[PDB]
Each structure stands twice: as C-alpha cells, then as structure tokens.
Amino acid sequence: PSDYMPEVADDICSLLSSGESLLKVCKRPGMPDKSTVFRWLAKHEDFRDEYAKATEARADSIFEEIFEIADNAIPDAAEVAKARLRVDTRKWALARMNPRKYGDKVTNELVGKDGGAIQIETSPMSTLFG
Amino acid sequence: PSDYMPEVADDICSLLSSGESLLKVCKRPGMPDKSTVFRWLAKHEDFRDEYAKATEARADSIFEEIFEIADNAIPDAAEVAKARLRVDTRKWALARMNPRKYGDKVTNELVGKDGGAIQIETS
Amino acid sequence: PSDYMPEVADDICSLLSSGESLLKVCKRPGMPDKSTVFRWLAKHEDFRDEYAKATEARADSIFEEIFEIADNAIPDAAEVAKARLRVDTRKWALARMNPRKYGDKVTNELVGKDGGAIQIETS
Amino acid sequence: PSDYMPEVADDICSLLSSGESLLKVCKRPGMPDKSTVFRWLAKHEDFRDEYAKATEARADSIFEEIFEIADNAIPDAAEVAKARLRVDTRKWALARMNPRKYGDKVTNELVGKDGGAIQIETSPMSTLFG
Amino acid sequence: PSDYMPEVADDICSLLSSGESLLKVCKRPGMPDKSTVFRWLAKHEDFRDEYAKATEARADSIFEEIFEIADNAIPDAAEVAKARLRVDTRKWALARMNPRKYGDKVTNELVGKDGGAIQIETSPMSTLFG
Amino acid sequence: PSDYMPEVADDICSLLSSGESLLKVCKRPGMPDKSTVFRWLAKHEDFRDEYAKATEARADSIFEEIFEIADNAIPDAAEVAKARLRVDTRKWALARMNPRKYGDKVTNELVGKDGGAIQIETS
Amino acid sequence: PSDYMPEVADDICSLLSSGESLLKVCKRPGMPDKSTVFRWLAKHEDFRDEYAKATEARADSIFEEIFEIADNAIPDAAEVAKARLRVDTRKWALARMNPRKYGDKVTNELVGKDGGAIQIETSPMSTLFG
Amino acid sequence: PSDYMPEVADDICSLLSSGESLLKVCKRPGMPDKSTVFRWLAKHEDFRDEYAKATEARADSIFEEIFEIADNAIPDAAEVAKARLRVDTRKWALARMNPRKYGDKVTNELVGKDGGAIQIETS
C-alpha cells in the first residue's frame, strides 16, 4: 500500500503496542514499508495520536521483554553479548519512548561547604551579560 | 478473556505482589494476555494504583533475587556474563518500579570557586 | 555542481527525510559533494531550517533501525561487537540530531541534608 | 511456618544483620519462605521496625564483606568476573539500604562563565506555565 | 614552508573542512609541519578566523564519517576494536569542536522531596564566607 | 565477649586507625565478633565518633595501598583483573569512609543558552 | 626509626614530591614503616605542612608520569591491562590530591523547557519542613 | 642546574608550547630536572603564568595527536588496547590542561514535574 489505510494503520498500532518493532512490523504480509508509514504519520493526525498511544504500550511491553531476553540467553559468549546488546538497546529506547516512566532516577542530597548550608554570595553584574 | 474484571485484576496484582512476573501471570489458564492487562490498566485508574503497589512489592522481591543470582552464578565465563546481564537488567528495572526507593543516590556538596561561597551575579 | 540551487536542496532534504544518509545522497549523479552541501547550508538560512527537519526525520528512521541491528546481529563475537558499535554510534548521533527527543532523560529528586529541606545561607 | 512467629522473625533479623541475604536465610532449617517473610512484614509493624534495623546492620556487614570477596578471589578469569559481579551487586545494594551512608559522594565546585560569577538573568513569564 | 603563506593556509582550511585531521594534512606534499601551522595560527588573525570556520565544517564532516567507520568495520575482533576507538575519539573531539551542537544532551525533570515541590530553607550566614 | 567495654573499643579503634580491617580486628583472641562491635557502636555515641576517626585514618592507609596493588600487580590476565577489582573496591569504599576527602571532584562551569546568561522566568 | 626525625621526614617529602608512592618510599633503606609515618604526621604539624606541599608536587609529577606509563606499555594483553590499571589508579588519586587542578571539568549550558527560559514557580510551604 | 633562570624557563615553555612533553624537555643536556622545574614554578608567579600558556599550547598539539594515534593503530588486539589507553590518557589530561576548552560539554534542559514549571517552596 502507498495510500493511507486506517485499517492497516490500526493493525500497525496493535502490533507495536505488543512490543514488536516497526521495521519488523513492516516485513509482515501486506504492510507498507517504513518510509510509507512515516509519510502516513506526517499527513494524518488521527494516525499520529493512535501511534503515540501505541508507542506508550510498546514501551510497557518491552519493559517486560528485557527480563526474558536476559533470563533466557543461551550461555554462549557471543549469544550473551547479543542478548546484552538487545537489552541495552531496549533500555535506551524505553527512556525515549516514555521519559517520565523510564528515564533515569536519581535522588540528590544537596549540602554545602563542610556539610553545612549551601553558601551563596550575590553581587551586581560586573559585565554586560544582559 | 478480554473484558475488564476486578478480582481477576486483584488476582494478577496479588500474583505480582508475591514476586511473579507479568509474563508468567499471563501464561496461566484463564488469564488475560499482556495486551489485555495493559488495556485494562489504561482505562481503569483503580487498577492502575493497585497494580502500582503490586509493582512495588514485586521490586522488593527482585531486590533479594539479585543477591542470589550473583552469589550462585556458575563459575564459567558465559554463565557469569549471563548472570551479570540478569542482574544489571534487574537493577535498571528496579529504579523504574520504585524510583524513590531504588533510584540512584548521590550526595552533592555544592561549593563555590576555590571552595569559597557560590558566586552569583543577577541582572 | 557547486552553485546553490533550491529544489536540489529540497531534493537532498526529502532524501534525508526518508532515512537516506548524506554520504549516499552525495554519491548520486548530479548531486553536490558534501563540502558543497555544507557551504550551501552555511550561507542559506532557509536551507538550514529545512535541512534541520530532514535531520529530525532522519533521526526517527535511525531510531527504528537500531532495533533491527541489535535483534538481527549475527551471533558471532566480532559481528556482535560490530553491531554494538553501529548501535552505540547511532544512539550517540540521535541525541545530537534531536536533543529534545533523543537526549538523555533524568528525573532528579532534590532534597536537603538528611532528607530535610535544602539549606541555603545568603550573603 | 505460615503464621507470624516473632521468635523466627527475630532470628531472621539477626542473620540479616550479620550480612546474610534474605533468600539464603529462608533456606535455613525451619525458616519461612521469602513470600511468607514479605507477608509477615506487610502485616506486623513490630517486625518492620526490627527489619529496618537489621537492614542497616546488614549494609554495614556487607561493606566489610566486599574487601574480602575482592581480596580472596581465585585468580581465574571466570572466578574473578564472578567476584566482581558479587561485589558490584553489593555496592549497588548498599546505596539503597542506606543512601545517606553509602550513596555516591560528589563535591561540585560551581563557577560561572569564564570562571567568574554565575550569571543569571530573570524575566517575567513569557508563557502561561502556572 | 616556514613563512606564512595564505594560499597554503587556505588549502589547509579546505582539507580540514572536509574532515581530514591536521597531522594527516601536514603530511601532504608541500605542507608546513604541524608546529609551523600552530605558529602561523598564533601570529595571523586572518588564518585564525578561517581556521575556526574550518573547524566547524570539520566537525560536521566527522559527524557523518562516524556512521561509515562503524558500518564498514571489518568483522574481525581487533579491527572492530580499532573502529570503536576511531569512533569514540571522534565523538569526544566533536563535542570540543562544537560544544553547542555536539555536546551531551540531557533533560532533567527536577522535583522535590517525595515528588512534591523542591523544599528550600534560607538562613542568615552562620560563618564569614564573604 | 559481648558486653560493651571502652579501652576494648579504644583498642579496636587504634587497630583500625593503624590500617587494620575490622575483620582482622575481630579475628583476634578476646575480640568481640563483628555483630558485637556494631551493636556497641549503635548504642554508644562516644564509640561512634571515635570509630569514625579510626575509619578516616584507615582510609588514609588504604589510599596508599591502592598504588601498591596497581603497580605490583602480577602481569597475568586473571591477576591483573583481580588487582583491578581490589583497587576499584577500595576506591569506592574510600569515598564512603571520608566523603569530603575521597568523594568525586567536579568543577561545573554553569552558563546559559548559547553561552550567555542563565535565563530564568519566575511565576 | 620510631621517634620523629625531621631529617627523615624531609627526605620522605622530597621523594613523594618526585612522584614516588609512600609505601614504596617506606621500603627504602632506613625509612620508617608506613604506620610510623602516619603517627609522625598525626603529632607534628611541621611535618603535616611539608607533607601537604609534597602531596601537591607528587600530583604534578604523577600527571606527567601517566603519559609515560601509557606510551611505554608493553604491547601484551596483560601488560596493557596493568598499565591501564596503573594509569586509572593515578587519575583517580590525582583528583583527590589536588581537586581544584585535577578534578573533572564540565561546562553545563543550562536552558529551560523547549530551549527557552528555565521556568520556576514558587509557592508557600505546604508542609512543615522547617 | 638548580638555580631559577628566566630564558631557561622561557626555553622550556617554548619547548612545551611546540608540543614537547616536560619529561623530554628535562632529558635535554643543561636542562633542570623535573623537581627543579616545579620548584621554580612554585616560587615564581611569572613563570607559572607563562608555563600555563605553554601548557595550553601543548594541549592543542595533543588534541591533534589523538586522531593519529587512533587512526594509525596497528590492527592487533594488544596494540589497539594500548592505543586506546594512550588516547584515553590524553583525553583525560587535555581537560585538565585547558578546562574551558577541553572539559566535558553538556546542555541540560531543566524542567519541572511532568514537564511543567519547576516547583519550589520556600521557608
């Protein structure tokens, strides 16, 4: 297909939601190629909105998948390295798909000199940085 | 099974809370598949919260699991590498399951130039 | 071909936007070499912006590419290492092509000493 | 045991305090399984309080243990990798068991443009971010 | 050449702009050695300005080059390691050549205690840090 | 030996202060086991402080130790890996024994967009 | 020696200043053992002051040394790993010996939402965090 | 040669400025050893500054050197590892020789909870 087809768009969203990657999805019988999907996306806001929802679901599916890829890795040096790569790629991607949920988490205890208060001295501007 | 049902949602939760993963929960007869679980969660806020605490409980189980995976690793190159991957994946996941508890911890001592006060100029 | 020409610049863009890299675009008959493309960009602001969105579109294509490179890696030491390099290079590049979208994501919970309020003294 | 048993809870706390991991503890003769311990924990505040103290002690014990795991590692490639994993897992866990004591430590010397003062310009809100 | 030669300076800028490294450029027929280029740079502002432009272009060229070095790496352990080194060296250098464009990119979602507001308590100075 | 006793607590301290680890101190005849040492510390604030300075003194000894471990490493793959683990463990531990002294050190030059002033809007 | 000996203290400072490590220095003919040096340090402020100066010089010497350790490494897998360890250990130590000179260096370009101004909303305290 | 002498100090500088390392400068006949160079620097502020610019010039030479070391690395495991160590050491050193130029570069987009404004409560 080249023409926008909502039925097909819907199927894409469903498959993505389950965790399948776009390139893999576009290899399925009857699917548009990736370039076409991106073009559909550019011109059809209904698809874009559904795609955003599919992306959120996709991330949640991948978050479960990473346990399985690690746990089921074949105990062979190269196969373990590949599992690691598949997992690391997913971890990186998850933070971009849903930054609020899957971004890094840090708690910073902020203290000042010698563990006391943070010491701040304010002055008038000394150069023209306006 | 596709139609949202509490008690089923309550069941899954209790199952996760006891340490069981969502994949295994969904591979049980009568259990909705992963897609259906997520759909539910998305459309039901009460299940979202309850699932969230199951998720926190699950994290506490996984926390103890990583010690076992590390300590009991088979002393062979590929098995140790696999154990490290299993542990690293869990560590990363734990921070997302309970950010306040399992997120990174840093104490930053903030000082100014040469260890003096922090110098600020305001326009 | 050295003289700046829209529609040619529009062409390159559309080509990048569809996922094609600048090297391949420039290795096409009639296409300006890389140096000439950059010269154009530098002296024409309208091409700079248009190229910038081609660049963002290109990033979205590369994002999907990294899954394929990782998942389809040949299970051999050197090939897996090469796949990892291809992926790491793309991940790094993506952040620069669209910083707001593909940059690192951190949530920092900022607290004060012993988890109390952040203590500040001002002069 | 399934029913809450303070005597057993107390023994768990003692063993944990000495650095032993929960899963290992639950393998000892007569111990409840991990799921049960977690259930005891959920319903009994007396156990939760004692468990928090045991967790603090556990971390202090592990902090000493890491030197030994490294120093005593068998000089074999795989055995060294495993020691490293056991150590790295403990380092990560310690920061979560007692963030104030075992979290990362950084001193940030904060300066501004060209090593001068930090330059700040304040303006009225330009959008409705309230 | 030892004496400053604008024609030669111009050629250097052109080659650098295309992504070639200075040391490699200075190995070309008729080129000054690196020390001389640096001396030309120190004394001739016209060259310095053109060199800054060449450095910006150089970075943009290298940014494309890294894909090729990775993608075309010979699938041999040592050759992959070398490609990685060539790539990592370029990534590091790019951020220094154009920090605004090629520096690291981070989005920090800043929150306070327990996910609420950031809690700040101000006090009068308690020591003489003026 | 379980009952808290100064001079014994003073002894342990002096022992740690001289570089000796708590494991070795506790493996000496007449010495309380690790559990008992910690119990003491927890219930006695004076021992807590004194032990804290023994800990800082111990850190200074370990600091010099890491040079020796690195420089004198046996030039064999597994031994070098073990030496690196011994050193990395010590480096990590040093930061916790004396955060102000052995913590990470960063100088952050803070600037605003495009290297201009930091732009803030306040509501 | 056990008794404090300024002549010996001075020699220690000289050797340290040149980059030699304390443990190595204490192996030299006639030197006190490390424990003794630390005890001398604790009780003699004149030695402490000279030792601080020696530590600064030591770091500057080590900063040059790292180039040599890397550049001269025997091209053998294990020997390269050891050189790396010797170098990494020195890099870490340098930042602690002189944090201002040898600490990490970062320039943070701080911007706000969507690349605009940093958006801050202040409110009255909502809990008693005083 | 131990007594501080300008022109000698000027010489060393010019030598460093041209890319030569302090070790080589000091291994030249008539040149003070490293200890003496440092002593000088410590007691003479004018030499400190001049040496500082030699150091910045040296950094610019090393910057170009790392490309050569990486690109011309012998395609053998141990040689590539050695080249990587030589490069990593230089990269680390460059940041200390000229922090403003060769330090790390980060752009932090600072936002508040859920991407809204940064929320602050003041006491």
The three-class DSSP label of residue A122 is strand
Torsion sign, CA atoms B99, B101, B105, B111? positive
CB-CB contact of B77 with D81 (8 Å):
yes
- CATH code where residue A21 lies: 1.10.10.60
What amino acid is encoded at E125 in this protein?
M
Burial C21-56, CB ≥16 within 10 A → b, else e: bbeebbeeeebbebbebbbbbeeeeebeebbeebbb
E22 located within any domain: yes
* Beta-carbon separation of G120 and H123 below 8 A: no
Measured in angstroms, the resolution is 1.9
Spatial contact of F40 and F2, defined as CB atoms under 8 Å apart: no
Residue E51 to residue C88: CA distance in whole angstroms: 30
- On the CB side of E2, how many CA atoms lie within 13 Å of its CA? 0
Contacts of F7 (CB under 8 A, 6+ apart): none
How close H105 gets to chain C, by Cα (Å)?
12
3-state secondary structure of B109: strand
Q: Taken in order G65, G68, G70, G76, is the CA torsion positive or negative?
A: negative
Q: Which residue has the tokens 């370029």?
A: E90
Q: Give residues 11 to 70 of H whose Cβ lies within 8 Å of F.
A: none
The secondary structure of H71-117 as a DSSP string is: HT--SSHHHHHHHHHHHHHHHHHHHHHSHHHHSEEEEEEEE-GGGSP
Residue F32 in domain: yes
The DSSP output letter for A108 is E
**β pairing state of G104-111 and F104-111:** parallel
Which amino acid is located at C20 in the chain? E
Cβ F75 vs Cβ F106: under 8 Å: no
Q: Which of B99, B100, B117 sits opposite C123 (nearest CB)?
A: B117
Beta-sheet pairing, B118-122 with A118-124: parallel
Rounded CA separation C11/C62 (Å): 20
For residue G115, being part of any structural domain is answered with no
The verdict on residue H83 lying in a domain is yes
Other beta carbons within 10 Å of F44: 15
Q: Are C111 and A108 in contact (CB under 8 A)?
A: yes
Q: Which residue of D has its CA nearest to B103?
A: D96
Number of Cβ within a 10 Å radius of residue H6: 13
E strand or H helix at H120: strand H118-122
Q: Which residue in this structure is represented by tokens 């303006």? A: D123
Query: Cα separations (Å) of D82 from B22, B70, F23, F85, F89?
Result: 29, 7, 22, 11, 14
Neighbours of G70 (CB within 10 A): 24
**B11 contacts: CB under 8 Å, gap ≥ 6:** none
In the block, tokens 């000054």 appear at: E32
Q: Do A115 and C119 touch (CB under 8 A)?
A: no
D113: closest CA among C16, A129, C101, H49? Answer: A129
Q: Count residue pairs from A and E with Cβ separation < 8 A.
A: 15
Cβ atoms of residues E66 and H68 within 8 Å: no
Query: In whole angstroms, what is the distance from residue A112 CA to residue D115 CA?
Result: 19
- Domains in chain E, number: 1
Q: Which residues contact E42 (CB under 8 A, 6 or more apart)?
A: none
The H or E element that residue G122 is part of is: strand G118-124
Whether the CB-CB separation of H54 and H13 falls below 8 Å is answered with: yes
In this complex, do F109 and H103 lie within 8 Å of one another by their Cβ atoms? yes
Q: Give, to the nearest 10 degrees, the angle between helix G77-97 and helix H77-97.
A: 10
Alpha-carbon distance of G76 to G22, in angstroms, equals 29
Give the separation between CA B99 and CA A104, rounded to whole angstroms.
9
Is the distance from CB of G40 to CB of G32 less than 8 angstroms? Answer: yes
Residues in chain D: 130
Q: Return the residue of E nearest to G122 by Cα.
A: E117
Q: Where are the alpha helices (DSSP H) in A2-129?
A: 6-17, 22-25, 34-43, 45-71, 77-97, 99-102
Of C90, C110, C119, C112, the closest CA to residue C102 belongs to C90
Phi then psi for E83, rounded to 5 degrees? -60, -45
Residues of E in contact with A121 (CB under 8 A): 129-130
Q: Which two three-digit tokens encode residue E95?
A: 């951020």
G5 vs A124: CA distance, rounded Å: 53
Q: With helix as H, strand as E and coil as C, how does B53-106 read?
A: HHHHHHHHHHHHHHHHHHHCCCCCHHHHHHHHHHHHHHHHHHHHHCHHHHCEEE
F93 vs B33: CA distance, rounded Å: 46
What residues contact F69, with CB distance under 8 A and at least 6 apart? F83, F86, F87, F90, G89
- Give CA–CA dist C46/C27, Å, rounded: 24
Q: Measure the CA–CA gap between C106 and C66, rounded to whole angstroms.
A: 22
Query: Is C119 part of any domain?
Result: no
State the Cα–Cα distance between residues H55 and H61, nearest whole angstrom: 10
CA distance B106 to A106: 7
Residue D129: partners with Cβ closer than 8 Å, 6 or more residues away: F121, F123, G113, G119, G121, H116, H117
d(CA F112, CA D45): 50
DSSP string of C56-119, one letter each residue? HHHHHHHHHHHHHHHHT--SSHHHHHHHHHHHHHHHHHHHHHSHHHHSEEEEEEEE-GGGSPEE
Q: For G41-86, give the DSSP string.
A: HHH-HHHHHHHHHHHHHHHHHHHHHHHHHHHT--SSHHHHHHHHHH
Burial class (CB in 10 A: 0-12, 13-18, 19+), H116: middle
**Candidate from B76, B114, B121 with C-beta closest to D117:** B121
The experimental method is: X-ray
* Nearest one of E48, E13, E49 to E31, comparing CA atoms: E13
SS3 content of chain B, % helix, strand, coil (to 5): 65, 10, 25
- What span, in angstroms and rounded, lies between the C-alpha atoms of B4 and A111? 49
Collapse the DSSP code of D122 into the 3-class scheme (helix H, G, I; strand E, B; otherwise coil) and give the result.
strand
Please give the biggest Cα pair distance in chain H.
67
Give the count of beta carbons closer than 10 Å to the beta carbon of residue B45. Answer: 9
**To the nearest whole angstrom, how far is the Cα of H58 from the nearest Cα of chain E?**
10
| Phi-psi map region of B114: left, alpha, beta (phi>0 left; psi -120 to 50 alpha) | left
CB A13 within 8 A of CB A50: yes
Q: Is the alpha carbon torsion for A112, A114, A117, A122 positive or negative? A: negative
| Distance from C-alpha of C115 to C-alpha of A107, rounded to nearest angstrom | 10
Contact criterion met (CB below 8 Å) for A102 and A63:
yes
- Whether A61 contacts A18, CB under 8 Å: yes
Cα gap B66→B19, rounded to integer Å: 13
What are the residues whose beta carbons fall under 8 Å from the beta carbon of G7, sequence distance 6 or more? Answer: none
**Cα dist from C31 to C55, E63, H66, whole Å:** 18, 20, 33
Domain with A68 in it: 1-103
Q: Is E32 helix (H, G, I), strand (E, B) or coil?
A: coil
Of G107, G123, G130, the CB nearest to E117: G123
Q: What are the respective helix, strand and coil percentages of chain E, to the nearest 5?
A: 60, 10, 25
Amino acid at D8: V
Candidates E107, E100, H101, B123; CA nearest to F114 is E100
Please check whether residue H105 touches F, CB under 8 A: no
CA distances from B13 to A65, B6, B50, C31, C33 (A): 19, 10, 7, 60, 60
Inform me whether the C-beta atom of residue A114 falls under 8 Å from chain D C-beta atoms: no
Say if F24 falls within a structural domain. yes
D41, with CB counted inside 10 A (0-12, 13-18, 19+), is middle
B-chain residues within 8 Å CB-CB of E129? 116-117
β partners of residue B112: none
Bridge partners for G107 per DSSP: F109, H105
Q: Of the candidates B106, G93, F89, which has an alpha carbon nearest to the alpha carbon of residue A107? A: B106
Q: Name every chain H residue with its beta carbon within 8 A of the beta carbon of G59.
A: none
Q: Which two tokens stand for residue D111?
A: 């300066």
DSSP one-letter code for F109? E
Listed residue (H74, C23, C65) closest to E85, CA to CA: H74
| Residue A2, number of CB atoms within 10 A of its CB | 10
G114, G126, G129: best to mutate for the E interface, most E CBs within 10 A: G129
